[PDB]
PDB file of C-alpha atoms and ligand atoms in Angstrom:
ATOM      1  CA  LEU A   2      -3.522 -13.975 -61.667  1.00  0.00           C
ATOM      2  CA  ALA A   3      -1.856 -10.539 -61.300  1.00  0.00           C
ATOM      3  CA  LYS A   4      -3.123  -7.930 -58.912  1.00  0.00           C
ATOM      4  CA  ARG A   5      -4.239  -4.640 -60.555  1.00  0.00           C
ATOM      5  CA  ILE A   6      -3.787  -0.989 -59.509  1.00  0.00           C
ATOM      6  CA  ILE A   7      -6.720   1.126 -60.749  1.00  0.00           C
ATOM      7  CA  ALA A   8      -6.677   4.918 -60.722  1.00  0.00           C
ATOM      8  CA  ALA A   9     -10.097   6.487 -60.102  1.00  0.00           C
ATOM      9  CA  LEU A  10     -10.860   9.954 -61.461  1.00  0.00           C
ATOM     10  CA  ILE A  11     -13.889  11.943 -60.380  1.00  0.00           C
ATOM     11  CA  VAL A  12     -14.941  14.159 -63.275  1.00  0.00           C
ATOM     12  CA  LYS A  13     -17.464  16.918 -63.880  1.00  0.00           C
ATOM     13  CA  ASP A  14     -17.987  18.920 -67.019  1.00  0.00           C
ATOM     14  CA  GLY A  15     -14.981  17.234 -68.522  1.00  0.00           C
ATOM     15  CA  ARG A  16     -12.601  18.290 -65.719  1.00  0.00           C
ATOM     16  CA  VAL A  17     -10.889  16.305 -62.984  1.00  0.00           C
ATOM     17  CA  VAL A  18     -12.573  17.419 -59.740  1.00  0.00           C
ATOM     18  CA  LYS A  19      -9.780  18.794 -57.547  1.00  0.00           C
ATOM     19  CA  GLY A  20      -7.152  18.241 -60.285  1.00  0.00           C
ATOM     20  CA  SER A  21      -3.738  16.721 -59.680  1.00  0.00           C
ATOM     21  CA  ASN A  22      -0.146  17.606 -58.722  1.00  0.00           C
ATOM     22  CA  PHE A  23       1.559  16.484 -61.928  1.00  0.00           C
ATOM     23  CA  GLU A  24       3.208  19.727 -63.013  1.00  0.00           C
ATOM     24  CA  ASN A  25       4.624  18.009 -66.138  1.00  0.00           C
ATOM     25  CA  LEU A  26       1.063  17.953 -67.543  1.00  0.00           C
ATOM     26  CA  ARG A  27      -0.127  20.767 -69.841  1.00  0.00           C
ATOM     27  CA  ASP A  28      -3.402  20.664 -67.964  1.00  0.00           C
ATOM     28  CA  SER A  29      -3.353  18.752 -64.666  1.00  0.00           C
ATOM     29  CA  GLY A  30      -7.138  18.933 -64.591  1.00  0.00           C
ATOM     30  CA  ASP A  31      -7.618  17.334 -68.083  1.00  0.00           C
ATOM     31  CA  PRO A  32      -8.952  13.816 -67.384  1.00  0.00           C
ATOM     32  CA  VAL A  33      -7.751  12.541 -70.765  1.00  0.00           C
ATOM     33  CA  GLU A  34      -4.199  13.843 -70.359  1.00  0.00           C
ATOM     34  CA  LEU A  35      -4.037  12.664 -66.707  1.00  0.00           C
ATOM     35  CA  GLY A  36      -5.431   9.257 -67.685  1.00  0.00           C
ATOM     36  CA  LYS A  37      -2.973   8.957 -70.521  1.00  0.00           C
ATOM     37  CA  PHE A  38      -0.111   9.809 -68.128  1.00  0.00           C
ATOM     38  CA  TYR A  39      -1.283   7.243 -65.600  1.00  0.00           C
ATOM     39  CA  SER A  40      -1.364   4.570 -68.377  1.00  0.00           C
ATOM     40  CA  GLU A  41       2.290   5.468 -69.278  1.00  0.00           C
ATOM     41  CA  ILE A  42       3.688   5.121 -65.750  1.00  0.00           C
ATOM     42  CA  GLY A  43       2.106   1.798 -65.030  1.00  0.00           C
ATOM     43  CA  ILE A  44      -1.518   2.012 -63.890  1.00  0.00           C
ATOM     44  CA  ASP A  45      -3.357  -1.165 -65.009  1.00  0.00           C
ATOM     45  CA  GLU A  46      -6.837   0.344 -65.590  1.00  0.00           C
ATOM     46  CA  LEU A  47      -8.671   3.621 -65.244  1.00  0.00           C
ATOM     47  CA  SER A  48     -12.059   4.326 -63.616  1.00  0.00           C
ATOM     48  CA  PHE A  49     -13.976   7.553 -64.293  1.00  0.00           C
ATOM     49  CA  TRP A  50     -16.903   8.620 -62.084  1.00  0.00           C
ATOM     50  CA  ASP A  51     -18.928  11.494 -63.544  1.00  0.00           C
ATOM     51  CA  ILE A  52     -20.960  14.027 -61.467  1.00  0.00           C
ATOM     52  CA  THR A  53     -22.078  16.380 -64.226  1.00  0.00           C
ATOM     53  CA  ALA A  54     -25.542  18.044 -63.954  1.00  0.00           C
ATOM     54  CA  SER A  55     -28.237  16.099 -65.678  1.00  0.00           C
ATOM     55  CA  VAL A  56     -29.058  18.366 -68.655  1.00  0.00           C
ATOM     56  CA  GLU A  57     -25.475  18.048 -70.000  1.00  0.00           C
ATOM     57  CA  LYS A  58     -24.514  14.698 -68.362  1.00  0.00           C
ATOM     58  CA  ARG A  59     -25.369  12.263 -71.138  1.00  0.00           C
ATOM     59  CA  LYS A  60     -23.417  14.121 -73.817  1.00  0.00           C
ATOM     60  CA  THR A  61     -20.595  15.013 -71.462  1.00  0.00           C
ATOM     61  CA  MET A  62     -20.016  11.367 -70.529  1.00  0.00           C
ATOM     62  CA  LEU A  63     -20.127  10.261 -74.113  1.00  0.00           C
ATOM     63  CA  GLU A  64     -17.554  12.889 -75.120  1.00  0.00           C
ATOM     64  CA  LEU A  65     -15.304  11.742 -72.252  1.00  0.00           C
ATOM     65  CA  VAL A  66     -15.390   8.078 -73.260  1.00  0.00           C
ATOM     66  CA  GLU A  67     -14.705   8.892 -76.892  1.00  0.00           C
ATOM     67  CA  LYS A  68     -11.703  11.098 -76.106  1.00  0.00           C
ATOM     68  CA  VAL A  69     -10.322   8.645 -73.535  1.00  0.00           C
ATOM     69  CA  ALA A  70     -10.605   5.598 -75.808  1.00  0.00           C
ATOM     70  CA  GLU A  71      -8.571   7.386 -78.536  1.00  0.00           C
ATOM     71  CA  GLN A  72      -5.662   8.109 -76.201  1.00  0.00           C
ATOM     72  CA  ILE A  73      -5.265   5.067 -73.941  1.00  0.00           C
ATOM     73  CA  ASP A  74      -4.877   1.348 -74.638  1.00  0.00           C
ATOM     74  CA  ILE A  75      -5.510  -0.090 -71.143  1.00  0.00           C
ATOM     75  CA  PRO A  76      -9.050  -0.971 -69.965  1.00  0.00           C
ATOM     76  CA  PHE A  77     -11.297   1.731 -68.558  1.00  0.00           C
ATOM     77  CA  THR A  78     -14.546   1.800 -66.676  1.00  0.00           C
ATOM     78  CA  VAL A  79     -17.097   4.644 -66.629  1.00  0.00           C
ATOM     79  CA  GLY A  80     -19.820   5.283 -64.035  1.00  0.00           C
ATOM     80  CA  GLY A  81     -21.923   7.840 -62.263  1.00  0.00           C
ATOM     81  CA  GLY A  82     -25.693   7.811 -62.675  1.00  0.00           C
ATOM     82  CA  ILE A  83     -25.849   4.937 -65.141  1.00  0.00           C
ATOM     83  CA  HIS A  84     -29.471   3.845 -64.523  1.00  0.00           C
ATOM     84  CA  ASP A  85     -30.585   1.763 -67.476  1.00  0.00           C
ATOM     85  CA  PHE A  86     -29.380  -0.432 -70.382  1.00  0.00           C
ATOM     86  CA  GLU A  87     -29.523   2.218 -73.082  1.00  0.00           C
ATOM     87  CA  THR A  88     -27.272   4.541 -71.139  1.00  0.00           C
ATOM     88  CA  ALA A  89     -24.829   1.734 -70.413  1.00  0.00           C
ATOM     89  CA  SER A  90     -24.938   0.560 -74.096  1.00  0.00           C
ATOM     90  CA  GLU A  91     -24.230   3.997 -75.591  1.00  0.00           C
ATOM     91  CA  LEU A  92     -21.165   4.421 -73.278  1.00  0.00           C
ATOM     92  CA  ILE A  93     -19.718   0.977 -74.129  1.00  0.00           C
ATOM     93  CA  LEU A  94     -20.266   1.429 -77.848  1.00  0.00           C
ATOM     94  CA  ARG A  95     -18.671   4.878 -77.758  1.00  0.00           C
ATOM     95  CA  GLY A  96     -15.509   3.459 -76.212  1.00  0.00           C
ATOM     96  CA  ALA A  97     -15.673   2.317 -72.648  1.00  0.00           C
ATOM     97  CA  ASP A  98     -14.634  -1.285 -71.784  1.00  0.00           C
ATOM     98  CA  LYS A  99     -16.817  -1.545 -68.631  1.00  0.00           C
ATOM     99  CA  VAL A 100     -19.586   0.319 -66.872  1.00  0.00           C
ATOM    100  CA  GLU A 101     -19.877   0.681 -63.148  1.00  0.00           C
ATOM    101  CA  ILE A 102     -23.362   0.601 -61.577  1.00  0.00           C
ATOM    102  CA  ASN A 103     -24.603   0.646 -58.017  1.00  0.00           C
ATOM    103  CA  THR A 104     -27.982   2.164 -57.036  1.00  0.00           C
ATOM    104  CA  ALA A 105     -29.750   1.233 -60.219  1.00  0.00           C
ATOM    105  CA  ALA A 106     -28.512  -2.372 -59.851  1.00  0.00           C
ATOM    106  CA  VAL A 107     -29.755  -2.646 -56.281  1.00  0.00           C
ATOM    107  CA  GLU A 108     -33.158  -1.311 -57.290  1.00  0.00           C
ATOM    108  CA  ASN A 109     -33.346  -3.539 -60.407  1.00  0.00           C
ATOM    109  CA  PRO A 110     -30.835  -6.435 -60.271  1.00  0.00           C
ATOM    110  CA  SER A 111     -31.946  -7.574 -63.709  1.00  0.00           C
ATOM    111  CA  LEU A 112     -30.062  -4.527 -65.033  1.00  0.00           C
ATOM    112  CA  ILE A 113     -26.861  -6.509 -64.414  1.00  0.00           C
ATOM    113  CA  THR A 114     -28.160  -9.342 -66.543  1.00  0.00           C
ATOM    114  CA  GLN A 115     -29.530  -7.022 -69.264  1.00  0.00           C
ATOM    115  CA  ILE A 116     -26.095  -5.383 -69.782  1.00  0.00           C
ATOM    116  CA  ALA A 117     -24.211  -8.727 -69.538  1.00  0.00           C
ATOM    117  CA  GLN A 118     -26.444 -10.382 -72.136  1.00  0.00           C
ATOM    118  CA  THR A 119     -25.289  -7.936 -74.819  1.00  0.00           C
ATOM    119  CA  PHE A 120     -21.805  -6.936 -73.648  1.00  0.00           C
ATOM    120  CA  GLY A 121     -20.681  -9.924 -71.606  1.00  0.00           C
ATOM    121  CA  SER A 122     -20.282 -10.262 -67.840  1.00  0.00           C
ATOM    122  CA  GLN A 123     -16.801  -8.757 -68.143  1.00  0.00           C
ATOM    123  CA  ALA A 124     -18.335  -5.414 -69.132  1.00  0.00           C
ATOM    124  CA  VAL A 125     -20.379  -5.142 -65.887  1.00  0.00           C
ATOM    125  CA  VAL A 126     -18.783  -3.793 -62.699  1.00  0.00           C
ATOM    126  CA  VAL A 127     -21.054  -3.561 -59.679  1.00  0.00           C
ATOM    127  CA  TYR A 128     -19.980  -1.066 -56.996  1.00  0.00           C
ATOM    128  CA  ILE A 129     -21.163  -2.231 -53.581  1.00  0.00           C
ATOM    129  CA  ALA A 130     -21.030   0.527 -50.889  1.00  0.00           C
ATOM    130  CA  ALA A 131     -21.158  -1.167 -47.463  1.00  0.00           C
ATOM    131  CA  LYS A 132     -21.011  -0.136 -43.862  1.00  0.00           C
ATOM    132  CA  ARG A 133     -21.269  -1.684 -40.401  1.00  0.00           C
ATOM    133  CA  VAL A 134     -24.692  -1.155 -38.814  1.00  0.00           C
ATOM    134  CA  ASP A 135     -25.605  -2.812 -35.499  1.00  0.00           C
ATOM    135  CA  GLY A 136     -22.861  -5.409 -36.062  1.00  0.00           C
ATOM    136  CA  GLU A 137     -23.775  -6.415 -39.625  1.00  0.00           C
ATOM    137  CA  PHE A 138     -22.418  -5.358 -43.023  1.00  0.00           C
ATOM    138  CA  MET A 139     -25.294  -3.547 -44.828  1.00  0.00           C
ATOM    139  CA  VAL A 140     -25.536  -2.287 -48.415  1.00  0.00           C
ATOM    140  CA  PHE A 141     -26.014   1.497 -48.959  1.00  0.00           C
ATOM    141  CA  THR A 142     -27.276   3.330 -51.996  1.00  0.00           C
ATOM    142  CA  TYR A 143     -27.613   6.991 -53.166  1.00  0.00           C
ATOM    143  CA  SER A 144     -24.005   7.986 -52.455  1.00  0.00           C
ATOM    144  CA  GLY A 145     -24.180   6.439 -48.987  1.00  0.00           C
ATOM    145  CA  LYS A 146     -27.421   8.183 -48.052  1.00  0.00           C
ATOM    146  CA  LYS A 147     -29.744   5.175 -47.827  1.00  0.00           C
ATOM    147  CA  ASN A 148     -29.400   2.002 -45.711  1.00  0.00           C
ATOM    148  CA  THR A 149     -31.163  -0.525 -47.987  1.00  0.00           C
ATOM    149  CA  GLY A 150     -31.491  -3.080 -45.177  1.00  0.00           C
ATOM    150  CA  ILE A 151     -29.915  -5.662 -47.561  1.00  0.00           C
ATOM    151  CA  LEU A 152     -27.059  -7.673 -46.081  1.00  0.00           C
ATOM    152  CA  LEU A 153     -23.734  -7.385 -47.882  1.00  0.00           C
ATOM    153  CA  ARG A 154     -23.521 -11.214 -47.793  1.00  0.00           C
ATOM    154  CA  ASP A 155     -26.780 -11.629 -49.698  1.00  0.00           C
ATOM    155  CA  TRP A 156     -26.175  -8.866 -52.195  1.00  0.00           C
ATOM    156  CA  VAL A 157     -22.680 -10.223 -53.152  1.00  0.00           C
ATOM    157  CA  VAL A 158     -24.178 -13.642 -53.912  1.00  0.00           C
ATOM    158  CA  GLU A 159     -27.028 -12.130 -55.944  1.00  0.00           C
ATOM    159  CA  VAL A 160     -24.666  -9.828 -57.928  1.00  0.00           C
ATOM    160  CA  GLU A 161     -22.662 -12.874 -59.116  1.00  0.00           C
ATOM    161  CA  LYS A 162     -25.858 -14.827 -59.808  1.00  0.00           C
ATOM    162  CA  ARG A 163     -27.183 -11.995 -62.011  1.00  0.00           C
ATOM    163  CA  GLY A 164     -24.057 -12.067 -64.220  1.00  0.00           C
ATOM    164  CA  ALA A 165     -21.760  -9.326 -62.979  1.00  0.00           C
ATOM    165  CA  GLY A 166     -18.129  -9.540 -64.019  1.00  0.00           C
ATOM    166  CA  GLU A 167     -16.411  -7.682 -61.098  1.00  0.00           C
ATOM    167  CA  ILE A 168     -17.253  -6.162 -57.709  1.00  0.00           C
ATOM    168  CA  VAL A 169     -15.847  -2.930 -56.363  1.00  0.00           C
ATOM    169  CA  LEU A 170     -16.184  -3.237 -52.572  1.00  0.00           C
ATOM    170  CA  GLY A 171     -16.299   0.274 -51.169  1.00  0.00           C
ATOM    171  CA  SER A 172     -16.080   0.662 -47.379  1.00  0.00           C
ATOM    172  CA  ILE A 173     -18.065   3.754 -46.306  1.00  0.00           C
ATOM    173  CA  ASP A 174     -16.349   3.290 -42.864  1.00  0.00           C
ATOM    174  CA  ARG A 175     -13.035   4.157 -44.669  1.00  0.00           C
ATOM    175  CA  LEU A 176     -13.857   6.453 -47.686  1.00  0.00           C
ATOM    176  CA  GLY A 177     -11.813   9.580 -47.345  1.00  0.00           C
ATOM    177  CA  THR A 178      -9.841   8.504 -44.204  1.00  0.00           C
ATOM    178  CA  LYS A 179      -6.334   7.436 -45.434  1.00  0.00           C
ATOM    179  CA  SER A 180      -6.459   4.943 -42.478  1.00  0.00           C
ATOM    180  CA  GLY A 181      -6.193   1.754 -44.616  1.00  0.00           C
ATOM    181  CA  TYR A 182      -8.419  -0.458 -46.746  1.00  0.00           C
ATOM    182  CA  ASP A 183     -11.196  -2.245 -44.891  1.00  0.00           C
ATOM    183  CA  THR A 184      -9.411  -5.687 -44.850  1.00  0.00           C
ATOM    184  CA  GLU A 185     -11.994  -7.172 -42.478  1.00  0.00           C
ATOM    185  CA  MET A 186     -14.695  -6.370 -45.044  1.00  0.00           C
ATOM    186  CA  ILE A 187     -12.619  -7.791 -47.872  1.00  0.00           C
ATOM    187  CA  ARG A 188     -11.945 -10.996 -45.950  1.00  0.00           C
ATOM    188  CA  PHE A 189     -15.694 -11.211 -45.178  1.00  0.00           C
ATOM    189  CA  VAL A 190     -16.642 -11.030 -48.857  1.00  0.00           C
ATOM    190  CA  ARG A 191     -13.778 -13.129 -50.351  1.00  0.00           C
ATOM    191  CA  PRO A 192     -15.305 -16.656 -49.626  1.00  0.00           C
ATOM    192  CA  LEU A 193     -18.723 -15.565 -50.927  1.00  0.00           C
ATOM    193  CA  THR A 194     -17.812 -14.883 -54.563  1.00  0.00           C
ATOM    194  CA  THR A 195     -15.625 -16.160 -57.368  1.00  0.00           C
ATOM    195  CA  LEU A 196     -15.552 -12.732 -59.012  1.00  0.00           C
ATOM    196  CA  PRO A 197     -12.648 -10.280 -58.917  1.00  0.00           C
ATOM    197  CA  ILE A 198     -12.888  -8.008 -55.885  1.00  0.00           C
ATOM    198  CA  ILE A 199     -11.629  -4.436 -56.288  1.00  0.00           C
ATOM    199  CA  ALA A 200     -10.942  -2.730 -52.961  1.00  0.00           C
ATOM    200  CA  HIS A 201     -12.046   0.887 -52.629  1.00  0.00           C
ATOM    201  CA  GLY A 202     -11.869   3.333 -49.681  1.00  0.00           C
ATOM    202  CA  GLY A 203      -9.155   4.270 -47.150  1.00  0.00           C
ATOM    203  CA  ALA A 204      -5.887   4.145 -49.157  1.00  0.00           C
ATOM    204  CA  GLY A 205      -3.173   6.219 -47.561  1.00  0.00           C
ATOM    205  CA  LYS A 206       0.214   4.522 -47.963  1.00  0.00           C
ATOM    206  CA  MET A 207       1.853   1.744 -49.940  1.00  0.00           C
ATOM    207  CA  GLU A 208       1.524  -0.840 -47.145  1.00  0.00           C
ATOM    208  CA  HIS A 209      -2.256  -0.497 -47.270  1.00  0.00           C
ATOM    209  CA  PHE A 210      -2.163  -2.056 -50.758  1.00  0.00           C
ATOM    210  CA  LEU A 211      -0.150  -5.058 -49.574  1.00  0.00           C
ATOM    211  CA  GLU A 212      -2.721  -5.566 -46.737  1.00  0.00           C
ATOM    212  CA  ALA A 213      -5.643  -5.405 -49.108  1.00  0.00           C
ATOM    213  CA  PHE A 214      -4.100  -8.018 -51.364  1.00  0.00           C
ATOM    214  CA  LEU A 215      -3.318 -10.259 -48.403  1.00  0.00           C
ATOM    215  CA  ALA A 216      -7.040  -9.954 -47.535  1.00  0.00           C
ATOM    216  CA  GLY A 217      -7.918 -11.404 -50.944  1.00  0.00           C
ATOM    217  CA  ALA A 218      -8.570  -8.372 -53.156  1.00  0.00           C
ATOM    218  CA  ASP A 219      -7.712  -8.798 -56.826  1.00  0.00           C
ATOM    219  CA  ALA A 220      -7.322  -5.070 -57.463  1.00  0.00           C
ATOM    220  CA  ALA A 221      -7.160  -1.858 -55.526  1.00  0.00           C
ATOM    221  CA  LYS A 222      -8.735   1.419 -56.594  1.00  0.00           C
ATOM    222  CA  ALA A 223      -7.281   4.714 -55.452  1.00  0.00           C
ATOM    223  CA  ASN A 224      -8.016   8.410 -55.967  1.00  0.00           C
ATOM    224  CA  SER A 225      -6.423  11.441 -54.323  1.00  0.00           C
ATOM    225  CA  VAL A 226      -3.483   9.501 -52.829  1.00  0.00           C
ATOM    226  CA  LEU A 227      -2.428   9.142 -56.498  1.00  0.00           C
ATOM    227  CA  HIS A 228      -3.574  12.481 -57.875  1.00  0.00           C
ATOM    228  CA  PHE A 229      -1.855  14.494 -55.079  1.00  0.00           C
ATOM    229  CA  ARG A 230       1.171  12.213 -55.244  1.00  0.00           C
ATOM    230  CA  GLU A 231       1.136  10.909 -51.679  1.00  0.00           C
ATOM    231  CA  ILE A 232       1.928   7.535 -53.326  1.00  0.00           C
ATOM    232  CA  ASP A 233       3.815   7.064 -56.576  1.00  0.00           C
ATOM    233  CA  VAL A 234       2.523   4.330 -58.936  1.00  0.00           C
ATOM    234  CA  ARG A 235       6.002   3.094 -59.915  1.00  0.00           C
ATOM    235  CA  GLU A 236       7.222   3.038 -56.320  1.00  0.00           C
ATOM    236  CA  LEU A 237       4.012   1.287 -55.290  1.00  0.00           C
ATOM    237  CA  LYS A 238       4.424  -1.493 -57.875  1.00  0.00           C
ATOM    238  CA  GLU A 239       8.119  -1.902 -56.990  1.00  0.00           C
ATOM    239  CA  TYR A 240       7.170  -2.147 -53.321  1.00  0.00           C
ATOM    240  CA  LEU A 241       4.428  -4.695 -53.935  1.00  0.00           C
ATOM    241  CA  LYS A 242       6.726  -6.878 -56.148  1.00  0.00           C
ATOM    242  CA  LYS A 243       9.490  -6.773 -53.498  1.00  0.00           C
ATOM    243  CA  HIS A 244       7.093  -8.252 -50.942  1.00  0.00           C
ATOM    244  CA  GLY A 245       5.821 -11.095 -53.128  1.00  0.00           C
ATOM    245  CA  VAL A 246       2.690  -9.606 -54.819  1.00  0.00           C
ATOM    246  CA  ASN A 247       2.212 -10.534 -58.481  1.00  0.00           C
ATOM    247  CA  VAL A 248       1.919  -7.115 -60.188  1.00  0.00           C
ATOM    248  CA  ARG A 249       2.754  -6.207 -63.754  1.00  0.00           C
ATOM    249  CA  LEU A 250       5.821  -3.992 -64.223  1.00  0.00           C
ATOM    250  CA  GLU A 251       4.549  -2.687 -67.565  1.00  0.00           C
TER     251      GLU A 251
HETATM  252  N1  6VP B  25     -15.166   4.120 -59.542  1.00  0.00           N
HETATM  253  C1  6VP B  25     -15.712   4.694 -58.724  1.00  0.00           C
HETATM  254  C2  6VP B  25     -16.416   5.354 -57.709  1.00  0.00           C
HETATM  255  C3  6VP B  25     -17.745   5.001 -57.365  1.00  0.00           C
HETATM  256  C4  6VP B  25     -18.406   5.661 -56.377  1.00  0.00           C
HETATM  257  N2  6VP B  25     -19.685   5.290 -56.069  1.00  0.00           N
HETATM  258  O1  6VP B  25     -20.318   4.236 -56.784  1.00  0.00           O
HETATM  259  O2  6VP B  25     -20.428   6.023 -55.057  1.00  0.00           O
HETATM  260  C5  6VP B  25     -17.832   6.717 -55.722  1.00  0.00           C
HETATM  261  C6  6VP B  25     -16.514   7.070 -55.992  1.00  0.00           C
HETATM  262  C7  6VP B  25     -15.860   6.420 -56.978  1.00  0.00           C
HETATM  263  O3  6VP B  25     -14.589   6.722 -57.320  1.00  0.00           O
END
């Protein structure tokens, strides 16, 4: 099917961490207004990652999803510290289409199945953070702090078996570098799963997205290259379409 461009917003206390360069916005740090604007210029989905302190986090994330769902019509995912079914459930019911889990899934893979049994596989996005270690792709948890010793290859297969709907494949080797998506890692994972693969980490220019889709990604997730306007969403989709990639032009 079509390839998808997904804008990722890191949020804290209801604000976009580090804001954006869209001077047309009344508040370029408002994640609702920014998300709405992205939906109007051709982003396919949104992804919110919350890093609010724990005393206010639960209510803060629920307020976010409720305000977002009112304003946008495209799918969105919420994540950041979702550790159990009840937390995932309250966020979906309040408006999110999908939840994104990582550390809690690795520690308890049945969490994937629990959420999927009530909300469907299509509501469960597993973020897999992976890095090369001694020549093998290994899975990392706790914001990259912990080498689990689980092979990427084995965790991909288990994630699909447990009922996840999509995988975000984040390359710790590329996060924050603007040097390109980790196409070798994407090509490594592609034959191991039938699920949609969302590339994350390393985006710096339009050609990087073409490369990631040639590697077999179904979607590409990007952050500051969009918010700081190093890449324009409408230029990006026109570029991808020109070179043969099936993207939706609204
Ligand atoms: N979506 C997302 C996302 C997830 C993680 N993460 O699961 O560490 C980090 C940054 C992100 O933008």
